[PDB]
Design a protein around this ligand. Structure first.
Ligand code: HEM
Ligand code: 5R0
Ligand code: CL
Length: 393
């Protein structure tokens, strides 16, 4: 009844161009079986949204990667938030929510905005820059580690550790094996910065440790909640801002619209998150036998959700393959959906908005003037290099 497919969603050819295979996955049926990894797959918006919003059936505590924590050891201690289910997930969630609160965004918005304007000004003095290393990487590296309260030394470990985490979600292919192989120094740095003495006052990390007396989390839970922000707080933002520049570079009509109205900067970033989906895929594990789209899925089965495919499903989106900065983007699953929907999305959207705002006000043109290089990762979509020439406004 369920179609079986040999498509490997974690192969280099798939990363290089996932969109044809994703239509094949969507049109084959609401639920597919991927013989390559012995998992169920859902690529349409409706089923992906349903799975995300049924955490009791499709749990996260047995792992959101291919590996079933009931069968294998996790490569690192489980995240108290990403790899946890209600009720154990609830209170660590509320703490990270209050740490990354609207009140916290108001305190850091000016500094994030000025750093974005200063970076775009610095890049316009060079002209021909690499939009990944000199922009998508440089700007979040200039605001987020300081906002965490991180020390200067060892920041070179932050992006490698994040790429390691995203790769460890994948199957045991060479990407995952090699990442875990080179992991030990990145782990040691990250875990050490999670301790309370190493987090400067006022920052996100010190605020997490300060939330350990309210009855929501204990002091021994604080280091791993800090680890969550050090795992997730940089890499997806880099790929997201890199996606927006990429989109604005390929669609000059939208850049001209964004210049004419800079208030579109926030939705311009949101549409880039839908269009490129920095987080392509995630797993769930069935806790019971369940019926999903006419398919009966037994207990203990891994279910792979194609978030990026769900954000391009024509059953849900009009002209899904077009970058439209005025699109009604509400409902896209680039940040997830339901109880696990990104708790740090206010930080990502703030960085993305103030960056596109700076580009909208200071840049006249963004032209690709060099070979574009893709970054391959088991979970994330993003570029390794984006050579652009920036024309000042
Ligand atoms: C463009 C930027 C980002 C994207 C596309 C993104 C994507 C996602 C997605 C899809 C999820 C859902 C995972 C799931 O359902 O299993 C998630 C959760 C999460 N994100 Fe983000 N994220 C971004 C930025 C951030 C930032 C800036 C932070 C922290 C400062 C962060 C921290 C987290 C955490 C802790 C979770 C787990 C929440 C939970 O399990 O309840 N993310 N993210
Ligand atoms: C941004 C993604 C979804 C990849 C993420 C979220 C949370 C964690 C964690 O460590 O809790 C790690 C990664
Ligand atoms: Cl680790």
């Amino acid at each position: 009844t369920i179609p079986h497919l040999a498509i490997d969603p974690f192969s280099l050819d798939f990363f290089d161009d996932p969109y044809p295979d994703q239509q094949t996955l969507r049109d084959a049926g609401p639920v597919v079986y991927l013989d390559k990894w012995n998992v169920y797959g859902v690529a349409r918006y409706a089923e992906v949204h349903a799975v995300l919003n049924d955490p009791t059936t499709f749990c996260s505590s047995r792992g959101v990667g291919l590996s079933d924590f009931k069968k294998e050891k996790p490569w690192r201690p489980p995240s108290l938030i990403l790899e946890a289910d209600p009720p154990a997930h609830t209170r660590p969630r509320a703490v990270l929510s209050k740490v990354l609160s609207p009140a916290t965004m108001k305190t850091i918005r000016d500094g994030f905005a000025a750093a974005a304007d200063a970076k775009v000004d610095e890049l316009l003095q060079r002209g021909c820059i690499d939009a990944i290393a000199d922009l998508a990487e440089a700007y979040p590296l200039s605001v987020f580690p300081d906002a965490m309260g991180l020390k200067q030394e060892g920041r070179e470990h932050l992006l490698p550790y994040a790429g390691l985490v995203a790769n460890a979600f994948g199957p045991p292919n060479e990407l995952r094996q090699t990442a875990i192989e080179r992991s030990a120094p990145h782990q040691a740095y990250v875990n050490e910065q999670c301790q309370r003495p190493n987090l400067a006052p006022g920052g996100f990390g010190a605020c997490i440790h300060a939330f350990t007396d309210t009855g929501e989390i204990t002091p021994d839970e604080a280091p791993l909640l800090v680890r969550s922000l050090l795992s997730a707080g940089l890499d997806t933002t880099v790929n997201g801002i890199g996606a927006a520049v990429y989109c604005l570079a390929r669609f000059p009509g939208e850049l001209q619209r964004l210049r004419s109205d800079p208030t579109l900067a926030r939705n311009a970033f949101e549409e880039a998150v839908r269009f490129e989906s920095p987080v392509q895929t995630f797993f769930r594990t069935t806790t019971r036998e369940v019926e999903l789209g006419g398919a009966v899925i037994g207990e203990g089965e891994k279910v792979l959700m194609f978030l990026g495919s769900a954000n391009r499903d024509p059953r849900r989106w009009s002209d899904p393959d077009l970058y439209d900065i005025t699109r009604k983007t509400s409902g896209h699953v680039g940040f997830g959906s339901g109880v696990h929907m990104c708790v740090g999305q206010l930080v990502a959207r703030l960085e993305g908005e103030v960056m596109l705002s700076a580009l909208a006000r200071k840049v006249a043109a963004i032209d690709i003037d060099g070979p574009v290089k893709r970054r391959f990762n088991n979970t994330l979509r993003g570029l390794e290099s984006l050579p652009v020439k920036l024309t000042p406004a």
